[PDB]
Write a protein that binds this DNA or RNA. Sequence first.
RNA 1: GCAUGGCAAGUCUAACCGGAGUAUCCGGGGAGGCACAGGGAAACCGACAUGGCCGCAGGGCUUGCCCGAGGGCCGCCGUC
RNA 2: UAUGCCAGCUGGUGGAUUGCUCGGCUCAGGCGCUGAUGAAGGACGUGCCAAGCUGCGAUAAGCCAUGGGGAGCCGCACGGAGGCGAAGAACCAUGGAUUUCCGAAUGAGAAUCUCUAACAAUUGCUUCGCGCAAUGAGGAACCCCGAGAACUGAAACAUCUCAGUAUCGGGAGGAACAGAAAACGCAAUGUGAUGUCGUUAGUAACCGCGAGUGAACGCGAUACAGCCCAAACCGAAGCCCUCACGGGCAAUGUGGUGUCAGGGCUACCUCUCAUCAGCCGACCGUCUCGACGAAGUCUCUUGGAACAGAGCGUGAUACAGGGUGACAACCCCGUACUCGAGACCAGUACGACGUGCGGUAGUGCCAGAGUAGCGGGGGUUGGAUAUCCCUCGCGAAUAACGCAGGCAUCGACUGCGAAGGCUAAACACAACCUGAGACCGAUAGUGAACAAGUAGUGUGAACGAACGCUGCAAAGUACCCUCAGAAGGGAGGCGAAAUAGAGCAUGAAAUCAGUUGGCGAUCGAGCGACAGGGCAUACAAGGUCCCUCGACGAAUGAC
Lengths: 115, 119, 246, 145
Amino acid sequence: SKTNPRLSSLIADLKSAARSSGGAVWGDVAERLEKPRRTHAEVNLGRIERYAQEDETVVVPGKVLGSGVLQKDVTVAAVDFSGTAETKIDQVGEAVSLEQAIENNPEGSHVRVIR
Amino acid sequence: SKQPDKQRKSQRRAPLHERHKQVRATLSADLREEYGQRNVRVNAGDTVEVLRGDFAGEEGEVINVDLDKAVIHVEDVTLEKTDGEEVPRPLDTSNVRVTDLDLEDEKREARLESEDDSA
Amino acid sequence: MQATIYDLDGNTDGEVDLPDVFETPVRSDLIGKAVRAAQANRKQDYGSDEYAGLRTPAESFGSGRGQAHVPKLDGRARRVPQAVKGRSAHPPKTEKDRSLDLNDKERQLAVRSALAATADADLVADRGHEFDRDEVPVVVSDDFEDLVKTQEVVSLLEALDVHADIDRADETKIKAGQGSARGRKYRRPASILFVTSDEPSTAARNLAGADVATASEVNTEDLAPGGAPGRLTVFTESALAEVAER
Amino acid sequence: TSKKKRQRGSRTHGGGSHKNRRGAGHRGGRGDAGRDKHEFHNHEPLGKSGFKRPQKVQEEAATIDVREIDENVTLLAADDVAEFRVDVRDVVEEADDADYVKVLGAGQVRHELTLIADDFSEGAREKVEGAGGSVELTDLGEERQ
RNA sequence: GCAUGGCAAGUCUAACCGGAGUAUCCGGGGAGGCACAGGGAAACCGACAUGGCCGCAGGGCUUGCCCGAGGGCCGCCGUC
RNA sequence: UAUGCCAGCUGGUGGAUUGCUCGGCUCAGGCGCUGAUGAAGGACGUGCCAAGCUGCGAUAAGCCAUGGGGAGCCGCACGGAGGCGAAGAACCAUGGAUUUCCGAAUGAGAAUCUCUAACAAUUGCUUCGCGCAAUGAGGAACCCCGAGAACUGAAACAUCUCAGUAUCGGGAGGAACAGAAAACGCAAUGUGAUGUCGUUAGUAACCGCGAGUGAACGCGAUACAGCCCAAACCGAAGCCCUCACGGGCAAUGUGGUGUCAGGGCUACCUCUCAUCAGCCGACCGUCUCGACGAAGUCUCUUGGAACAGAGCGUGAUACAGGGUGACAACCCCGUACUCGAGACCAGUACGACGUGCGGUAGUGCCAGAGUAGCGGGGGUUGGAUAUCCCUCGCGAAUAACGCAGGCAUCGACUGCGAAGGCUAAACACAACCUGAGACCGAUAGUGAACAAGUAGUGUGAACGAACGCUGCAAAGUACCCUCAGAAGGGAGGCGAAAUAGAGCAUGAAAUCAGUUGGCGAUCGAGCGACAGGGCAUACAAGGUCCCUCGACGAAUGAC
Ligand SMILES: [Cl-]
Ligand SMILES: [Cl-]
Ligand SMILES: [Cl-]
Ligand SMILES: [Mg+2]
Ligand SMILES: [Mg+2]
Ligand SMILES: [Mg+2]
Ligand SMILES: [Mg+2]
Ligand SMILES: [Mg+2]
Ligand SMILES: [Mg+2]
Ligand SMILES: [Mg+2]
Ligand SMILES: [Mg+2]
Ligand SMILES: [Mg+2]
Ligand SMILES: [Mg+2]
Ligand SMILES: [Mg+2]
Ligand code: NA
Ligand code: NA
Ligand code: NA
Ligand code: NA
Ligand code: NA
Ligand code: NA
Ligand code: NA
Ligand code: NA
Ligand code: NA
Ligand code: NA
Ligand code: NA
Ligand code: NA
Ligand code: NA
Ligand code: NA
Ligand code: NA
Ligand code: NA
Ligand code: NA
Ligand code: NA
Ligand SMILES: [Sr+2]
Ligand SMILES: [Sr+2]
Ligand SMILES: [Sr+2]
Ligand SMILES: [Sr+2]
Ligand SMILES: [Sr+2]
Ligand SMILES: [Sr+2]
Ligand SMILES: [Sr+2]
Ligand SMILES: [Sr+2]
Ligand SMILES: [Sr+2]
Ligand SMILES: [Sr+2]
Ligand SMILES: [Sr+2]
Ligand SMILES: [Sr+2]
Ligand SMILES: [Sr+2]
Ligand SMILES: [Sr+2]
Ligand SMILES: [Sr+2]
Ligand SMILES: [Sr+2]
Ligand SMILES: [Sr+2]
Ligand SMILES: [Sr+2]
Ligand SMILES: [Sr+2]
């Protein structure tokens, strides 16, 4: 019983993509977002920096926060980013919405889930 | 106030001098132009035309004005009792229109013709 | 985007950039939350007399007279909730907090979101407003503030193919229920919202269902009456600009 | 629909036998009654322990870990840049209502730093120097002897 | 506790102040609270932005083999 | 088929339900003292007819003046009679007149009356005479000073808790109380009267260290304001009453000076805008009250009535609310705009009069005693060694001194001058006024929409109900018949409706009369559920059902 209309559409789009393309991540991410908010991911930059690798889109089934330092040049796809998170990321890489990610990579390939 | 109870209250309990406004009636087109007012306090001298009830269409002289009940008696506007006697059927002034005034009172006429105030 | 400006004759007279806020994603849940809060916050505290039903030394006779142990006085039952003339068990209480809190950020987000719903002709139409226009909201020259007569605003609205909404709101409803006994006999549709800059339009305010506001303090309710986003609005050249930094 | 809203007709409203929900007997006494007898379980144990020093003879240090400082070096552009130089006192929030500022050594230091503070931990120093940096003790900081 | 929603290494204002469409509402107010370090009665001291091994989901590949967030088992670090 | 069962029909009984609201409930803003010049309260009177309520007071629902108001009026209360009003009544506002008796109740006494000039009683002044004055009692709560429980919690109970609560005694005001540091003690190169609000904080502290109790400094705010004596040094330079004359007070000190930016004194510099006293005296704002105030009462149809439907038209700085024979911006009152008056803010702010701020040097001249402090015994508090107070006993210094900074003593350091006093504003309450409502809607909401603290109960303290609705208009039923009949009945008249005819909108159930269907005087009791037959059935809102035969034909399955 999610209340945010945009969250609902995102979740529906994620499913559409997983059922129609060579991707299982999107379906997976859809399932985690359907779970209660308290289980949603809250990841700071330090964690992305530690497990991300270039040319592998980092996918966060939640929201990205701005503690720590990101140096790698990666593309991070998340439900949302804090103002600072989005700022630090864009400086050395790129911040993208799961909505954009699903459109550029419906098959959801070369992607790494981080929480 | 905006509360219905208080509105009806202030009306039913208004002191006598404040009840004149409860017996006012609209003026004919001519009179409105003549005295620059839209209506007036019906007097026992005026002539009036009934515009609404079962007596709509009848005109007559106002024979009485009761401030206690805020109603008026108009000549010929009556009901026939059981014994055959004829009695007046009281009318609310808002259902009436003044077509002729009784200006025998200097004060009333002055008030009517004055501009700052109305009668 | 770009918004077309109109002069008091209803003729195009240039245009300006529709401020960014009008592109805020529409959030009906946040808007609904904001309205729900404003509506709750003006409600008055009430409750029954705390001693109602307790003004009596009534006592129970206990066992012995073949009667239920009910407090009685002068052979009449009293005080207890099951007794006629007895106290109310769990009545309305004055001490109850009837207000709703709302983080400033969450409320401000709703205002911007309600603002953005004003620029979507489809939403505005779905909300219910009647108009024969394509561009929305309606932006007019600041001379609008100098208008005085209500009918002058009528002409401008007719010339703007927007007067139909006022006709929609030109019908009151006499509500079902006892609200009438408390002064709430009527209610009527919400028509056009006029947002000016210096002071609310006295010339437009009496229009059926119309509301007037100022860019500095226009809130979620006038932008989305009842919490339903997409009100047919008419901004003022400068009002449009001031609203940009809300 | 809520749980409360579904109780009409149930008689006992989830209380079990209608003889249960009466007075405090149903709670074994009011408040923390029995915390040493029938309901001793999971209660802190009885007794006194320790002492307290008077509040106006107590010091409250304002601390900060090198990690915090170091991760925001560039961001702290509004502060010295040498061969960076930073007065921790001008960094730590709550630095006013504190008796002194102390730098702790939690985390890493990926820059050469010259830190000015009222006090440092053994580890904070070993780290700041180890990365080709230095540590400067304030005048107040000169209260170590 | 839980569900939903905002913001996030921060978050929220309280009284109260100005405005106004005047109990709503718009702006202001961060006092102070909780979180951002712990341990110790106290004096006082003051920590893993990752070192190892398993491995779910997911990803990759030449289809068993790599990468493996979260999680699991350890090391190691602060303090008594 | 009698007595009778079940369901319905017509008519009752009853007053549920629906709709309605002259009353409640709660919130908000404003405002806020009365009384010996006899209050508040009560009694008894007072009307053409007058029992209750309201008003009033032997001038008795009222008298007078000024302003408003206006052609009507003679309260609730819609009768009869009579009267008043253009000599401007009614009505409203302001001011005045009258204002019985009891009542603080005050000449004495008394269940509202009586007996023979009255501040009774206690005080101050005093012309020592009640000559001039004060006190007394009331008020919804709020406020200040005293007295002070228990049920209860601790699952018993004693300290503790409930709680300085309930209740009692005394007392002031519109608000009270507090208040210009012998403070604080984020210890400082720091803050700077006092309430209050938010926080500090369920922190420190207390406690059969149990249950529980529980601050402060500070900070952010609100509002802001600071002064006067005692003494030193002067020593009648003074005060009160009276028009005056004159009297009284006052050396046991009136008055000047002065008040920790210490002061006085002696010697100087300079200067006053501090303070204090008095004079004048608002704007604005807020609350209430009032004046003014736009635009349809057009056509047709329905209706008893148009405020309905359809058609045409209009105002709006006014589309809040109410009224009017039904859904009304435009019929009436109002509403927006504009304007006026009173009250509060406030005798405040500003302004002006007078006074005169301050600084140097010298001077042990002055600066509040059963006090500060200690001990015994109690209460109280978070106050723990370190709260505040009462009581018994003891008891200091003199600024070169003294108190404080959370155990005691001594030194240092920092703060500050007790034992005299006054003080605006910001805050509490809700009687009174006005406004408001996701509150109740007549077994509700007040006990009280009505005769309501009424009727009624009790020796008394005290206790205490129930009762709302004709109709558009009374048109509130003429005449006739019947009857012992102003009864009731019949017939009749009115109205859209009397199945609206008086507790008179609607009119449920229980239940009663009459009656329709089904059953019924040879038969058995949780009153039914499910199947199946009889009998009964206006329409509408359900339209299916039966028999031959044929098609399909699961498990099962023959003669
Ligand atoms: Cl993280
Ligand atoms: Cl401690
Ligand atoms: Cl301080
Ligand atoms: Mg005129
Ligand atoms: Mg009751
Ligand atoms: Mg209803
Ligand atoms: Mg006497
Ligand atoms: Mg006990
Ligand atoms: Mg006690
Ligand atoms: Mg015990
Ligand atoms: Mg206590
Ligand atoms: Mg303190
Ligand atoms: Mg009642
Ligand atoms: Mg009836
Ligand atoms: Na009572
Ligand atoms: Na409340
Ligand atoms: Na029970
Ligand atoms: Na501070
Ligand atoms: Na803060
Ligand atoms: Na008052
Ligand atoms: Na009478
Ligand atoms: Na009198
Ligand atoms: Na006297
Ligand atoms: Na005397
Ligand atoms: Na017990
Ligand atoms: Na016991
Ligand atoms: Na105890
Ligand atoms: Na009318
Ligand atoms: Na003592
Ligand atoms: Na001190
Ligand atoms: Na009743
Ligand atoms: Na049958
Ligand atoms: Sr009358
Ligand atoms: Sr009357
Ligand atoms: Sr017994
Ligand atoms: Sr339960
Ligand atoms: Sr009980
Ligand atoms: Sr328990
Ligand atoms: Sr035990
Ligand atoms: Sr702070
Ligand atoms: Sr905030
Ligand atoms: Sr791990
Ligand atoms: Sr001050
Ligand atoms: Sr002194
Ligand atoms: Sr000490
Ligand atoms: Sr009743
Ligand atoms: Sr009541
Ligand atoms: Sr008795
Ligand atoms: Sr008849
Ligand atoms: Sr048997
Ligand atoms: Sr077969």
